[PDB]
Amino acid sequence: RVTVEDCVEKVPNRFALVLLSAHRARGISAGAALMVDRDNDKNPVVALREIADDVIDHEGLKEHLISTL
Amino acid sequence: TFDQIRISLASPEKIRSWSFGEIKKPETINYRTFKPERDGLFCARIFGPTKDYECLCGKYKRMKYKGIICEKCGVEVTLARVRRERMGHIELASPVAHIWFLKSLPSRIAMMLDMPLKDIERVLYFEYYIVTEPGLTPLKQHQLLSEDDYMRAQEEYGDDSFTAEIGAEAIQNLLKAIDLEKEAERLREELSGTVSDMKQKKFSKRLKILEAFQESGNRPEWMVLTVVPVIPPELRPLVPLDGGRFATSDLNDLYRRVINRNNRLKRLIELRAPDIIIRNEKRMLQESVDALFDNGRRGRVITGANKRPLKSLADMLKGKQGRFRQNLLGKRVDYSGRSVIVVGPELKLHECGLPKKMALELFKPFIYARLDAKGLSGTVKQSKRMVEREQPQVWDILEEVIREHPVLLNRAPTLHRLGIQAFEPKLIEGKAIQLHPLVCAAFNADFDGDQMAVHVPLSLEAQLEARVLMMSTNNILSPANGRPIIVPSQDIVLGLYYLSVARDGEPGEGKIFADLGEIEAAMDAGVVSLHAKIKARHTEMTPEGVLLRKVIDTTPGRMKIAALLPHHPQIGHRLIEKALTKKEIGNLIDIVYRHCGQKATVIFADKVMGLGFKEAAKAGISFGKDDIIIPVRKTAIVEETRKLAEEYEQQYITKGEKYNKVVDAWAKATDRVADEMMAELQMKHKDENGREKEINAIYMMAHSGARGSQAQMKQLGGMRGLMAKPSGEIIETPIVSNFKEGLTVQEYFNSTHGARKGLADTALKTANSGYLTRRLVDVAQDCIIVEEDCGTTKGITLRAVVEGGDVLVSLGSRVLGRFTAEDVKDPGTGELVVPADTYIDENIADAIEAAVVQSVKVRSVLTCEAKIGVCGACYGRDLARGTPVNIGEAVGVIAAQSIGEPGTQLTTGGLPRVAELFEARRPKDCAVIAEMDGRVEFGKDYKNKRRIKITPDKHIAVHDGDYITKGEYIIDGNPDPHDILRILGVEALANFLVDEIQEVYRLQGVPINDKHIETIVRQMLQKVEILEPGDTGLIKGDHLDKPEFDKEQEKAIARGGRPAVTQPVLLGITKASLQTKSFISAASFQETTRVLTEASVHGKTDTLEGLKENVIVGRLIPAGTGSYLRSLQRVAAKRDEQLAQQRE
DNA sequence: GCATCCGTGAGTCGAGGGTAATAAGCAGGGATTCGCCCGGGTGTCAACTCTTTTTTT
DNA sequence: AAAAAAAGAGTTGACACCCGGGCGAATCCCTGCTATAATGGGAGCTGTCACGGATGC
Ligand SMILES: [Mg+2]
Ligand SMILES: [Zn+2]
Ligand SMILES: [Zn+2]
């Protein structure tokens, strides 16, 4: 229900956005979504909508998740 | 995990280590009870048990222990999966030579010890006798006495100091006695200081094979294998079909025959049979061995029952079951469906209709998970029972689960990347998949009988990845060129053209309307016509602020579709003044997408589609018999031409008369009636009342450009010209008739001939297009944008094409989308219009186009000198999106797809010309370039050819007296690219190839950007020769990375000696993958025989860097998402190493 | 340095469903395999004795 | 305010039986031996090019 125009404007890579939204959805699966309401939306769409009004430099947690074994 | 796949020769010790037991009896199964045999091909003791956790003979079938072994039976209890990973070996009484290293194109065994291939075949067939270890007696080594008299009568020189052997043992002893170091040292000295006329061609190959056998660690004696391993009993199954009749694979026959021949030879050796019978047995055994591997080199082995030839291991991996398209690359996929497609105007652009039957089956696990989480069901088994009976409550769960899950839809002939586009499924009745009228143009598929497949992404990352990367709303621009693909095809464009037309004679003209609502109310009452001269109030917002709504004089048809245009400068009611042609409406969607965002473009395309359909269904677009009219002057023109052609026949040379009478009388008459009917149709009739009655249907259809054309209307209403016979020439008989009137059988026969010729031509040329597309994707599959900036200052000059006094392509459109190499200066006025290195936007584009300017140096992918891959500072602006290309996007694959897309519609040029140009073969005998300067000297003294003219300081078209300079085009048409690259620079050859390809593609009317051609040309040139013997005595071609890495290492070892520099070498796209580094990418497209045998002796290790290797291994492709994930993993490893450094 | 001869290629998704032919003979001795039956370890039941939580006194 | 028992445990003999291991018996597979004279074999293309390479004097 939301275009990828603002998402590409926030992050011009167009490839890191997919991984960022996937990590945001995996985090919103349990105890999250305190920034934007659901509004009858699923996890990926709500994550993409929240990315338009959220910090884009949140890949630190994604990098630290696979930092060690 | 695993990396760095390595392939080399397998020694007998390794084969024995792999095998578990030796097979001795060719017994598959028992006839009374179907069970494995003791030593047969299907053995439980050798290939594990058949049942899972159940040994044979009913002793340890409890399945509680897995480490025990049945004493009486002799097989351990293990899962059935172990039967597929266990191999067996067969012992051979006599050595046998490998068929791959013997009958291959380059004789690998013949390359060793300088032995001809004709002599090796005689020794293997036991025909002649070879001599080795010669003494002081005659018959020196390598004598190869042919007749038996030389082996017995000529052997009267003592029973010692003379050894002679025959068969595979001779080759084995020769390979075991040969040395590598001494031969390499002898060939190294002989290579240096030699005339190098013909001996070099063999010495180079011998030195290469010797150095490969040295460093690889494979002895030369492994060619003659002694033990042959057997495939496990799972790839050659013996499953019993329905009815009790078994069905086994054809591989069991070869193994059974080999085992039988080996047992027969073993029994012969024990019985002490004569040499004549034992020799034939060894010959038959060797034939069975080297036929079990290939079965094509030697005589064909056909079974007595079946009439088809058996499929050996080599033929099983070439085209049918190999990794080409059967198992590795192309495989079946579940969670998919297929059904016919239909058109739906109510659906949105990102929504597609999906039948309830297909959706209920594809989303079964999702429905199960929803029923589990919703609480309406309990056990999973119970849930499986609820959907089987099709309860009415399951429909509500299906609509809730299918809310945002995108499904992938693709047509059968996936030519370009636009063929696969994701949509949002919506439940609908029926069994036909609904579709959008605008999206059907992208798939390139009519709605007559075509069917589309549907896929479902299961993973959450893949589901979310297709929404923002593969959605239909995002794919609005074609990847080949910046042209919108959502233009109205047939009906919307026709309706918009009908609404854009304005007629001076109409009722209710001259009134002023403030709002469109007043216009609609007046049209409802009928006081005002649909289109007529009217002055209304409309807002434009040209100064980017607020407008006073200045009055505009346009018809009610105008400003009704203009209201859908978004509010933005540079666009407004001024752009709708045109007639709204198909090209005009296509250009209109480009400017709205260029100026405004993507949402406005898609919403405008959605709004304009409904208006066009609503307007077309209200007017009388019905085509009738009175719509098509024949010109009244044609009846006189044809009779005048017939009367004029009569005098030419009585005069007559017959060839000249028949040629001049048909190309002048009928050619001029065919064009006269055409323009006559065109003028009669374009004329606007005036009704008695004073208003235009109506416009012709076919004329409007031809002018709008939706379906009608000029040639079609001419053949429908004109004279049809003259038909062509299958020979090639035009028939002299005049076919003066059209489809409206009757046609006799004689004139229809020629039309049938032409139609059948065209149909036969279009059926074969499409296969060549597919072959070229498959060949181009394999050569440019390694081109991936990895770096952002390269720092290169070089570039290639770009000029516009011009034919006489007119230009074909503007300089702004050609240079647009590429980063400027150097700061362009305005000609005449000393002003810098563009910086040194900046992105050429549309503003800079039309600024450079306004002021006249010559060619400008622009960076390109061919001039880049970065690391492996391609940087984003040389590719330029992306074609799919307005913004520049992102890092990780695959450029080679998209370039190959864009080059192969316009195929199947081509044709001295066309599809075969393009295929020959891309391969860079020999076009024809052409004059070699002089490559001299100043004074030119004579050539050869009539030695059947002119080699070269030296000036130290056949049909000839250049005089020896005139001076000659380097680059002079002294050559017929279609020059050779090899000498062109040898004499001139690589940039000249690249520009020539780009010009030729662009001309061949523009002669048919298909626009294609030169970026893809430049990328393909760069992928072509990747190897450089060697002229200096410093650190590398070879002269053969080598990859471009080795000298860049070897020269830096050679200079670091010792600056003394001499450097190494050599000009690059060109090669076709086919051979570009022949000598590639990774053998897996080469074995997929090329022949698997020459690729495997060549890479086997060298022992090349694949690093899994290319895209083809990751697809075969089943890993993430190093492009886009895969590239970003690999970069993240690399940075995480770096951070972990930094953290571990401080901790010690 | 040229003339003659032997390998590779041919798009892609869909339908359609199973098949088919020759035919020596008998005597010696062992290895294999199917029927019955005793049998010892596994189940399925009559039927004799401590504990205790109350429910009754 | 007191004081003993249907269950709950715990066994103790008492069958019912169910594949296992032998005893048989009935029957499969192998191998060799037959004495007038037998004395070199049957398909298969051949209605695509074109390239790209491997032998020869
Ligand atoms: Mg169709
Ligand atoms: Zn067993
Ligand atoms: Zn570059």
Curated annotation (Swiss-Prot), chain A:
Reactions catalysed, as given in the entry: RNA(n) + a ribonucleoside 5'-triphosphate = RNA(n+1) + diphosphate
Disulphide bridges, residue numbers: none
One GO cellular component, as annotated: DNA-directed RNA polymerase complex
Presence of keyword Transmembrane: no
Molecular function as annotated in GO: DNA binding; DNA-directed RNA polymerase activity
Keywords carried by this UniProt record: DNA-directed RNA polymerase, Nucleotidyltransferase, Transcription, Transferase
GO biological process: DNA-templated transcription
Coiled coil: none
Enzyme class at the top of the EC tree: transferase
Family membership: Belongs to the RNA polymerase subunit omega family.
Assembly with partners or alone: The RNAP catalytic core consists of 2 alpha, 1 beta, 1 beta' and 1 omega subunit. When a sigma factor is associated with the core the holoenzyme is formed, which can initiate transcription.
Function: Promotes RNA polymerase assembly. Latches the N- and C-terminal regions of the beta' subunit thereby facilitating its interaction with the beta and alpha subunits.
Record-given protein name: DNA-directed RNA polymerase subunit omega
Gene: rpoZ
Full-protein residues shown: 3 to 71 of 119
